Protein: O-methyltransferase family 3
Amino acid sequence: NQIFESVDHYISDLLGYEDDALLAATNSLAEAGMPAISVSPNQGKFLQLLAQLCQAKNILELGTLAGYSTIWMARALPKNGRLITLEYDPKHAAVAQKNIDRAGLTSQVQIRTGKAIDILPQLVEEGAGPFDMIFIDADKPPYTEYFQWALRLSRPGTLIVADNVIRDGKVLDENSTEPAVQGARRFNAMLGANTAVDATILQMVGVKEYDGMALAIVK
Amino acid sequence: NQIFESVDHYISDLLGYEDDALLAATNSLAEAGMPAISVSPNQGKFLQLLAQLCQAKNILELGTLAGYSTIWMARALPKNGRLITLEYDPKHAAVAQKNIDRAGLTSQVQIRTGKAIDILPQLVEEGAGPFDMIFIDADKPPYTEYFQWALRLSRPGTLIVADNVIRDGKVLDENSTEPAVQGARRFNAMLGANTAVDATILQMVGVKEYDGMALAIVKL
Ligand SMILES: Nc1ncnc2c1ncn2[C@@H]1O[C@H](CSCC[C@H](N)C(=O)O)[C@@H](O)[C@H]1O
Ligand SMILES: Nc1ncnc2c1ncn2[C@@H]1O[C@H](CSCC[C@H](N)C(=O)O)[C@@H](O)[C@H]1O
Ligand SMILES: [Mg+2]
Ligand SMILES: [Mg+2]
Structure:
């Protein structure tokens, strides 16, 4: 992995500058005892560019952690735009709130604390959709079901992005016993059979373990 | 590279289906002595998806080869959409025209034969722009100047994509002797310095050699 990390540092040195709010969001993970699993700086910038191509005014994120990915995307929003992010762990949600406040995004970002599978039908009842872009990055086994709820909260042209769908190439092992690999494989099979979207999977290398993100556009 | 190749085939079995027109465009290369350097199927679907996000009506492509990338992007267009593709080699242009005709894309694709640096100022003079998406994929040394012309043919929100800007990590080598590597390094420096766009570089692995594509959006 060394060449991929060195090339990622080359790219972030040109195009992946992180202000105090993004660095503080990263620094908050270890002091809070949270896992070091945010998107990378360059992945962050890529999510921001996708939100700009979507001309996104309304973004939904499942899985906030410390709000690193949230800050990157919310920075693409217009003044009147909104990002709703779902986080199960009340400690993660409190840390993310501090980090979003430090980024001056309190007004545009709403953190909802609970399981995505409980909150997604709430968003349906509220008529919270449709969203211009949806980022699925929570627990891995129910990605397939999160995608079905995302469709209910989409319009034609909505972008749905799902992170961690390759898992170091372990998705090739049909006999994998790892929950996160089985979750990825089931989601990828659903995505291959889904006639409601146009989709691809991007292999991703860099500072993080070899992985990939799925991208889908609602027909 | 074996794991990346195996994962790419896994991905294209799910989401990278190629019809006769794309398979025929690939098959056309060997009989014409052309390099097997088109975008991969999965890269082709990615460019198609970027064109759909752009809601592209007008696309510009530098470097046609056999029209493989051209067919993937043109298929995102509405019928009244147009794609202009530039190609220096008349042998390549004639193969690409056959492949575009086979794909049913004759109305939507205009292949222009000559040096990109000669045609781009003609496009500005004709008012051919602005393009919703621009794909820079010709010879590598003038990438920096192709990008300057692309900005003259853009509007706010235009997506510019440049292929082959990592070259197996050789862009880390400040003493590279390879003009294509030197061209990518100069392009990536320019892109780092450019205040007219928001940009990133995506590292790309799969069936082809380790490389990367630059994505830039012209600021609003
Ligand atoms: N059922 C569930 N609903 C919502 N969030 C969940 C969940 N199960 C786990 N999570 C949360 O999903 C997150 C995954 S990590 C998210 C990383 C973040 N998007 C970033 O890149 O910065 C964790 O914070 C975890 O607590
Ligand atoms: N100065 C120049 N102007 C225009 N095209 C050029 C050029 N120098 C090289 N080319 C052409 O650029 C092409 C690069 S390969 C293009 C591959 C194609 N985009 C695909 O993915 O399917 C070759 O066809 C080459 O002949
Ligand atoms: Mg993730
Ligand atoms: Mg190329």
In short: The first strand of chain B starts at residue 58 and ends at 62.
